[PDB]
Design an enzyme around this catalytic site. Sequence first.
Site, PDB file in Angstrom:
ATOM      1  N   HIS B  89      -6.976  -0.897  50.245  1.00 35.08           N
ATOM      2  CA  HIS B  89      -7.497   0.333  49.697  1.00 35.08           C
ATOM      3  C   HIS B  89      -8.676   0.784  50.567  1.00 35.08           C
ATOM      4  CE1 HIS B  89      -5.001  -0.130  46.015  1.00 35.08           C
ATOM      5  NE2 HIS B  89      -5.363  -1.418  46.059  1.00 35.08           N
ATOM      6  N   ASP B  92     -11.960   8.042  50.143  1.00 34.49           N
ATOM      7  CA  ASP B  92     -12.177   9.312  50.820  1.00 34.49           C
ATOM      8  C   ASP B  92     -12.991  10.155  49.835  1.00 34.49           C
ATOM      9  OD1 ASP B  92     -11.930  12.153  51.557  1.00 34.49           O
ATOM     10  OD2 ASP B  92      -9.801  11.917  51.920  1.00 34.49           O
ATOM     11  N   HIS B  94     -14.529  13.649  49.080  1.00 33.81           N
ATOM     12  CA  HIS B  94     -14.539  15.039  49.558  1.00 33.81           C
ATOM     13  C   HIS B  94     -15.960  15.586  49.672  1.00 33.81           C
ATOM     14  CE1 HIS B  94     -10.207  16.192  48.051  1.00 33.81           C
ATOM     15  NE2 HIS B  94     -10.233  15.141  48.844  1.00 33.81           N
ATOM     16  N   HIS B 129     -10.881   9.877  46.373  1.00 36.21           N
ATOM     17  CA  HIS B 129      -9.641   9.195  46.058  1.00 36.21           C
ATOM     18  C   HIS B 129      -9.336   8.176  47.134  1.00 36.21           C
ATOM     19  CE1 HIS B 129      -7.368  11.339  49.165  1.00 36.21           C
ATOM     20  NE2 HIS B 129      -8.061  12.406  48.772  1.00 36.21           N
ATOM     21  N   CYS B 130      -8.434   7.252  46.806  1.00 36.57           N
ATOM     22  CA  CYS B 130      -8.030   6.275  47.838  1.00 36.57           C
ATOM     23  C   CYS B 130      -7.092   6.949  48.820  1.00 36.57           C
ATOM     24  CB  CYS B 130      -7.387   5.107  47.085  1.00 36.57           C
ATOM     25  SG  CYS B 130      -6.841   3.750  48.146  1.00 36.57           S
ATOM     26  N   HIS B 139      -0.967   5.903  46.475  1.00 40.34           N
ATOM     27  CA  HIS B 139      -2.167   5.386  45.796  1.00 40.34           C
ATOM     28  C   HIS B 139      -2.790   6.489  44.934  1.00 40.34           C
ATOM     29  CE1 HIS B 139      -2.918   1.497  48.157  1.00 40.34           C
ATOM     30  NE2 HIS B 139      -1.735   1.931  48.523  1.00 40.34           N
ATOM     31  N   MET B 144      -5.604   6.420  41.620  1.00 37.19           N
ATOM     32  CA  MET B 144      -6.896   6.268  42.294  1.00 37.19           C
ATOM     33  C   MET B 144      -7.626   7.542  42.668  1.00 37.19           C
ATOM     34  SD  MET B 144      -6.079   2.837  44.504  1.00 37.19           S
ATOM     35  CE  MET B 144      -7.812   2.343  44.378  1.00 37.19           C
ATOM     36  N   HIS B 249      -7.655  25.337  29.742  1.00 37.36           N
ATOM     37  CA  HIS B 249      -7.913  26.312  28.694  1.00 37.36           C
ATOM     38  C   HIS B 249      -8.356  25.558  27.436  1.00 37.36           C
ATOM     39  CE1 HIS B 249      -6.849  29.602  25.798  1.00 37.36           C
ATOM     40  NE2 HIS B 249      -6.226  28.694  25.093  1.00 37.36           N
ATOM     41  N   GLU B 273     -10.538  32.888  29.916  1.00 37.76           N
ATOM     42  CA  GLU B 273      -9.670  32.275  28.904  1.00 37.76           C
ATOM     43  C   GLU B 273      -9.077  30.990  29.474  1.00 37.76           C
ATOM     44  OE1 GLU B 273      -6.061  34.822  28.042  1.00 37.76           O
ATOM     45  OE2 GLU B 273      -6.671  35.896  29.831  1.00 37.76           O
ATOM     46  N   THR B 274      -8.687  31.032  30.751  1.00 37.66           N
ATOM     47  CA  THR B 274      -7.989  29.943  31.421  1.00 37.66           C
ATOM     48  C   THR B 274      -8.449  29.909  32.875  1.00 37.66           C
ATOM     49  OG1 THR B 274      -6.006  30.192  30.016  1.00 37.66           O
ATOM     50  CG2 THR B 274      -5.686  29.113  32.134  1.00 37.66           C
ATOM     51  N   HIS B 300      -2.603  25.082  30.594  1.00 33.96           N
ATOM     52  CA  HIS B 300      -1.877  26.124  29.905  1.00 33.96           C
ATOM     53  C   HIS B 300      -0.517  26.500  30.466  1.00 33.96           C
ATOM     54  CE1 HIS B 300      -1.067  29.391  27.220  1.00 33.96           C
ATOM     55  NE2 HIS B 300      -2.227  29.150  26.692  1.00 33.96           N
TER      56      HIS B 300
HETATM   57 CU   LIG Z   1      -5.534   2.546  47.020  1.00 27.70          CU
END
Ligand SMILES: [Cu+]
Lengths: 336, 336, 336
Positions: B89, B92, B94, B129-130, B139, B144, B249, B273-274, B300
């Site tokens: 594993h 990352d 962002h 995330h992985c 993954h 993950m 929503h 609303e959404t 929604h």
């Molecule tokens: Cu992973």
Amino acid sequence: QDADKLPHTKVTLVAPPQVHPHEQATKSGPKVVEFTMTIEEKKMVIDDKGTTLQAMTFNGSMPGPTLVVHEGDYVQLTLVNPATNAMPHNVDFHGATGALGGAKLTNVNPGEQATLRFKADRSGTFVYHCAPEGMVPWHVVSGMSGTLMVLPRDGLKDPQGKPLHYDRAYTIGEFDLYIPKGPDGKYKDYATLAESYGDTVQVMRTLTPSHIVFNGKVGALTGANALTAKVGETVLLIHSQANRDTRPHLIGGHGDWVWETGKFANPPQRDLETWFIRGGSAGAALYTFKQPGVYAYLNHNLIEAFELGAAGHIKVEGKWNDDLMKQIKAPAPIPR
Amino acid sequence: QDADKLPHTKVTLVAPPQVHPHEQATKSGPKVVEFTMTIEEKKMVIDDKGTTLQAMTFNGSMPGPTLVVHEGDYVQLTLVNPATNAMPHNVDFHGATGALGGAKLTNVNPGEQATLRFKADRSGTFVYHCAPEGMVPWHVVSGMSGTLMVLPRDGLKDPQGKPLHYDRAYTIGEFDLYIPKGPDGKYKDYATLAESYGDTVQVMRTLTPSHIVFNGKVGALTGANALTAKVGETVLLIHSQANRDTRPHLIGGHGDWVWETGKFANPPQRDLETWFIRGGSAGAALYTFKQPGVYAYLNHNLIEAFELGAAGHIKVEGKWNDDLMKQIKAPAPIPR
Amino acid sequence: QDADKLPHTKVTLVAPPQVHPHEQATKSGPKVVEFTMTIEEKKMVIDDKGTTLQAMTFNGSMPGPTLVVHEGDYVQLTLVNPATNAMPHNVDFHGATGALGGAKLTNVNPGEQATLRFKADRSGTFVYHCAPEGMVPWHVVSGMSGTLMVLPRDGLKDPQGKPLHYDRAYTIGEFDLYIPKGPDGKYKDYATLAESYGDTVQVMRTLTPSHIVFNGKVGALTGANALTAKVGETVLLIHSQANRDTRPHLIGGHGDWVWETGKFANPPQRDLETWFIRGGSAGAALYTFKQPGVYAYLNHNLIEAFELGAAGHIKVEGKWNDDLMKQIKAPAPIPR
Ligand SMILES: [Cu+]
Ligand SMILES: [Cu+]
Ligand SMILES: [Cu+]
């Protein structure tokens, strides 16, 4: 502002991912900018396994070339459909007003050409694509789309009106392809373009692409064909998708300033991790590289990027900056 | 601003849907905030019918915990991959700049750990995330991912720069799962993680999830496990989707102030609303409850919410307000 | 602002695509605006090939009528479910606060009616739809949704606060339909509404619509039933999608001013080629026609528009303007 009494100039188009030379801010007043594009129908190899597509392109590439003009200019396009093609074509410019985007005035059968002029009065990146009556989706998904970029005469600006400038511009077209598979579980190969139609429309109706690629093929912008830049350079990444949504992201980077709907009279958004390009539109992001190394630029539906093909690379030269990121302890045995 | 000479502090992470204690606006200057996360590969029950998933998680939960820091802080993460896991594993982020989000500097095999430091210089909610080379989508869809929230040092602000404040924050991770089915029309059960791979990639390629859940399972946030609040409280709802778009929503409510792209230097939108969370990103909404009762918080696309699982509940205490809504005539026979 | 002591007024609803008469800016203060809607369950023909749908509608149409009020007004709705229907219904107004949007206070069995009042305190176009406990998606995809438009009392404004005004308003509802097919490869026909349920939920779970139509059927707004306008007129195009995303585009035109999330307290975006309506929401665009001719208004996933049905036409009267676009050379033989 009569167009016929303005200066005329000719632009030589280049293949993606480059964009032809142009000025960002300009002192010049409006002109008539002349372009020529030739349609090329051809069978192309779209992956590393030898899968073929009966493709249709503007100028022999997917996407077609990016055309750049300034707000207030007039686009004058000569569309050429050689006699070696089999189908009729035309062009619909989303940056144009009237006549189905110009499609009504540019119907050209193999062996014909036509010239259209339209005023580029709205700034932004706009899709253009072929749109023949009754066969629209098929010509678009087979490869006929590109981008028209209309820059504001004063260049790009941030939300407070401060000037933004880029060093380099790259254009990525993202194509959802619908290649039929036969009982073998092998993609079909067709002798002619016309022969692929019936099967291709059946795959299209499932709404599930077999492949989604950047610029014409899996791996078009990876490894040896990566995009390039240097730490300190500001790049403009133009991304068009004429049929299906996409959600671009640069791994290890960000969108410093992004116009995800692609229209430059609106204020851009900053610091985005991932942005959204609506099917039928083009958008643009600016990023200034701060760290060297390889970056991936991809659709962040990670199945669409890694399994179906929508991922490319940017190779950046320069010096690492340990303030932004630093490995404190390399991978090692846990302590016992 | 050298990081090595700044104060260091340790945060104790808590499980979703709660978020660890933190200050919104802070007087303190930049620090190095230390976190530790341990990867746990485990088989989990994802619905009420006994369907299982061979899952992969950060800290034993889906999503992983939310980490909160202020703009200008340095994140210092120790990633631990116990010897009882089977796969390699990495992570990352962002919200980080360079090295594939940190993925290149955190490759850890079972029995190894690594420590990464990066400057959190951009405010907003960001996915982490992985992302192991060649196995990224698997993954991520197995569980993950989580969120990093980087608050502006001055706290959240509305479009006119007026201060916004929340009483409570909740974090929802939304997971599109691809569980294979066999001829019975029954979901497959696998003895080991590695055994589920081949079949799972085939389902992934269809782009059609079998289940889409909030926080690890159908009904995770419904009935007895509903979220809670009181009339007059302002809640911050953080929603991450690392692979696929979603459109949150609140039934009976609204998004008072929403950053759907999740980046706090941009002005939020009001009265939605959404809203739309792009796959590969996290966004955030603020809402002040005005009426008591049960609310549903869901994607929604109502098939994705009610048939596939992407719906949760918020139970609110307080007094009804008849000015906002009032039954004038209860259901009764039509008049004849 | 007690509602019971405000003036009351009755509005007569009209069928889509028209919208009932209303004032944009108003001098009047708040009122209680009374509407009545009757549910009609009926079998309808949805394409030109004779395909049927066991439909469920508000007032006999898809979408239900658009209701228009001003910010601060109170909506007072009488929902009528005749004894000739078979199912229970209710209504969830996204523009309302509390009680699951009003759904909890409007449960009506065949032969019953109920009256609900709620304060419309947030401006924008909002979806309303039926939402019976445990059967929500089915009533929504069978046709039960429409729009509530809450105008600001001062009328629409651009980003600098300058007044915007429209001459004509049209309302388009876009419906993703899930009609089951049998071994023949022919769509099933059902004797009763209840009989279509089981098969329909199985198609729904694939997330792939068989048809996606504007206002109730393929071709509802095409050819003879096109929308109409004149060069110089400003039209407001309201577009609702209660379950699935869509990406509207006018071929040959643009969105001059667009609120794609549909909420009028936010600044609109200008010059859009294609905008995005999130499933579970309604949005609105303004456009002033500059060229005569036929325009197509469609979802720009071109398979969804041309293969599945999501396309309509706008027929515009007036004089061509050669400055905006001009054919320089009609299609002709290439030169040899
Ligand atoms: Cu992973
Ligand atoms: Cu074409
Ligand atoms: Cu209903």
